[PDB]
Amino acid sequence: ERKYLELKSQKNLYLARLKSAIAAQKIEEIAGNLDNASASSLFERIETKILELEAERELLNPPPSPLDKKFEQWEEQQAVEATLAAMKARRS
Amino acid sequence: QEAPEDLLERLLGEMELELIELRRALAQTIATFKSTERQRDAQQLIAQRWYEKAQAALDRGNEQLAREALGQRQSYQSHTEALGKSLGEQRALVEQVRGQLQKLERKYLELKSQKNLYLARLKSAIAAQKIEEIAGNLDNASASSLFERIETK
Amino acid sequence: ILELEAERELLNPPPSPLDKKFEQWEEQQAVEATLAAMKARRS
Amino acid sequence: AALDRGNEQLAREALGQRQSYQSHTEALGKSLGEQRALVEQVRGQLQKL
Amino acid sequence: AALDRGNEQLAREALGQRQSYQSHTEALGKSLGEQRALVEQVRGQLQKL
């Protein structure tokens, strides 16, 4: 009987750690879906979808070329500086 | 198939069920451990009584009885020593697992925090692809289905 | 009963004995420091 | 009234007991100061609103 | 309050424990800064849209 109760005592010890192992293998499993290797079924897939929709607007509404934007910014800055120079010169 | 987005809320929601279940399972472990510790305390306490009984046996010149009392105690010594080994061994397993759960829940809440971050930007992307879509009907290339068509009419 | 005790242990983990010992030690040092100040001031 | 007359021992317990109230007093003081910011800002808004 | 009075040993543990929060603080700070770029750009678009 001393062995039986001791065996029963051990039985519970492994059951708890067993279910901890059951939890251990069943908790990071879905965290496994998130993959640093970009192999995630959904997390990586969902980001790719976001980029896909971004391209949809890129083709639908192509942005102005950087040169015209740079020239736009440059001329605007030159125009801003030209206007700024005019104000200070007039208001000097 | 069901939308993965709906699963995100459910998947973490279902994680809580196991997270609490793990919490419940862990609690059962410690209670039994303390019960074992209390049992160990009782056995050594009982073993001490034999020494106390043996302490009153050697006196008055009757050393013979003290031999039996101490010999009987050795039976508890084996139980006490044997149980002590079990108690020390189980300490390593309980200590390591407890820290993991604190880390795991921290990851879970952090994962849930990220889950919301992408959901908002996701729906922003859903809006982003669903707002200029009809503005896409208006085409500078004169390919508009209605706006260009209506002007031609 | 022990099981429910563990429920509060995980739910409301107690401060570590070192911080409690340091808390008690510093509090005792603070108490002794305050006690020394009172007697020195009130000497 | 405990330290006087040479019985400094009792004063230790009386002051040690006070430290229990000091924690409550100090803890409550932190709560009181924190709530001041929220009450002050909201009151001005209602006048504006 | 640990290093003072010559008990530098306790200060080591207190500061060592803080490093655990430093990792959380530093790690969280990186996340906070990264998310700033995404929130800022989207807000302007809605006003334009």
Side-chain angles (χ1 to χ4, degrees):
Chain A
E1 61 185 2
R2 180 189 301 166
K3 183 62 174 298
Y4 171 82
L5 53 87
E6 182 62 16
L7 289 166
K8 188 151 55 179
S9 177
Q10 301 172 12
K11 176 176 63 55
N12 307 264
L13 176 56
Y14 293 85
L15 285 164
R17 274 166 37 261
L18 164 58
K19 296 144 192 177
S20 179
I22 297 173
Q25 194 269 358
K26 193 58 175 62
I27 55 192
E28 215 67 3
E29 168 175 352
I30 289 165
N33 305 142
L34 174 59
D35 192 332
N36 301 328
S38 304
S40 175
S41 300
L42 184 281
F43 175 88
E44 185 277 347
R45 173 181 177 274
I46 213 173
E47 178 59 19
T48 54
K49 169 54 62 175
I50 295 170
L51 301 174
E52 181 178 7
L53 311 195
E54 179 276 350
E56 173 56 20
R57 303 315 200 190
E58 188 68 5
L59 61 91
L60 184 65
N61 303 267
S65 61
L67 294 174
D68 65 74
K69 297 284 276 290
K70 185 184 67 56
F71 173 61
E72 175 62 21
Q73 184 57 217
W74 173 82
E75 75 187 349
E76 285 291 356
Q77 288 296 299
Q78 294 282 112
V80 166
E81 290 293 355
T83 53
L84 288 166
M87 297 301 94
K88 61 185 72 178
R90 165 56 186 83
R91 302 167 67 178
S92 56
Chain B
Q1 185 59 18
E2 289 71 4
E5 289 70 5
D6 193 327
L7 314 186
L8 307 176
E9 317 301 44
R10 180 192 60 80
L11 289 163
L12 279 66
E14 297 294 350
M15 272 294 180
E16 185 64 11
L17 280 295
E18 188 161 37
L19 290 165
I20 64 187
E21 180 59 18
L22 169 56
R23 235 171 303 282
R24 197 286 311 278
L26 191 163
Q28 304 176 274
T29 310
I30 312 309
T32 61
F33 158 81
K34 302 297 181 61
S35 178
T36 308
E37 181 179 0
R38 187 176 302 182
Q39 295 157 209
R40 185 282 318 276
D41 304 329
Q43 296 300 272
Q44 62 183 9
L45 184 65
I46 297 162
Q48 174 56 22
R49 298 294 181 275
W50 281 98
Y51 169 85
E52 297 175 1
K53 293 183 291 190
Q55 176 57 20
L58 191 160
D59 302 1
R60 306 172 297 198
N62 194 341
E63 80 305 345
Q64 178 54 218
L65 306 185
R67 303 171 180 271
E68 303 179 0
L70 290 173
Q72 178 54 221
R73 159 159 173 158
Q74 311 314 291
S75 58
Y76 301 165
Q77 296 302 149
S78 59
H79 309 161
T80 299
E81 296 293 351
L83 293 166
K85 300 171 184 62
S86 180
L87 286 168
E89 183 277 347
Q90 299 175 17
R91 276 181 159 80
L93 297 78
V94 299
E95 292 291 353
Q96 56 82 20
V97 60
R98 194 186 310 95
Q100 298 180 137
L101 177 51
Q102 186 285 133
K103 161 173 54 49
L104 292 160
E105 61 185 2
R106 180 189 301 167
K107 183 62 174 298
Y108 171 82
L109 53 87
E110 182 62 16
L111 289 166
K112 188 151 55 179
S113 177
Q114 301 172 12
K115 176 176 63 55
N116 307 264
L117 176 56
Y118 293 85
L119 285 164
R121 274 166 37 261
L122 164 58
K123 296 144 192 177
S124 179
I126 297 173
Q129 194 269 358
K130 193 59 175 62
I131 55 192
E132 215 67 3
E133 168 175 352
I134 289 165
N137 305 142
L138 174 59
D139 192 331
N140 302 328
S142 304
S144 175
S145 300
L146 184 281
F147 175 88
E148 185 277 348
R149 173 181 176 274
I150 213 173
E151 178 59 19
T152 54
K153 169 54 62 175
Chain C
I1 295 170
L2 301 174
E3 181 178 7
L4 311 195
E5 179 276 350
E7 173 56 20
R8 303 315 200 190
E9 188 68 5
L10 61 91
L11 184 65
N12 303 267
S16 61
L18 294 174
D19 65 74
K20 297 284 276 291
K21 185 184 67 56
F22 173 61
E23 175 62 21
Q24 184 57 217
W25 173 82
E26 75 187 349
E27 285 291 356
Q28 288 296 299
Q29 294 282 112
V31 166
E32 290 293 355
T34 53
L35 288 166
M38 297 301 94
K39 61 185 72 178
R41 165 56 186 83
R42 302 167 67 178
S43 56
Chain D
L3 191 160
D4 302 1
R5 306 172 297 198
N7 194 341
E8 80 305 345
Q9 178 54 218
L10 306 185
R12 303 171 180 271
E13 303 179 0
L15 290 173
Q17 178 54 221
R18 159 159 173 158
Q19 311 314 291
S20 58
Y21 301 165
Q22 296 302 149
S23 60
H24 309 161
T25 299
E26 296 293 351
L28 293 166
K30 300 171 184 62
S31 180
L32 286 168
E34 183 277 348
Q35 299 175 17
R36 276 181 159 80
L38 297 78
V39 299
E40 292 291 353
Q41 56 82 20
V42 60
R43 195 187 310 95
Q45 298 180 137
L46 177 51
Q47 186 285 133
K48 161 173 54 49
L49 292 160
Chain E
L3 191 160
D4 302 1
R5 306 172 297 198
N7 194 341
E8 80 305 345
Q9 178 54 218
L10 306 185
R12 303 171 180 271
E13 303 179 0
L15 290 173
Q17 178 54 221
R18 159 159 173 158
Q19 311 314 291
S20 58
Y21 301 165
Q22 296 302 149
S23 60
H24 309 161
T25 299
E26 296 293 351
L28 293 166
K30 300 171 184 62
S31 180
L32 286 168
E34 183 277 348
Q35 299 175 17
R36 276 181 159 80
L38 297 78
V39 299
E40 292 291 353
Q41 56 82 20
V42 60
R43 195 186 310 95
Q45 298 180 137
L46 177 51
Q47 186 285 133
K48 161 173 54 49
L49 292 160

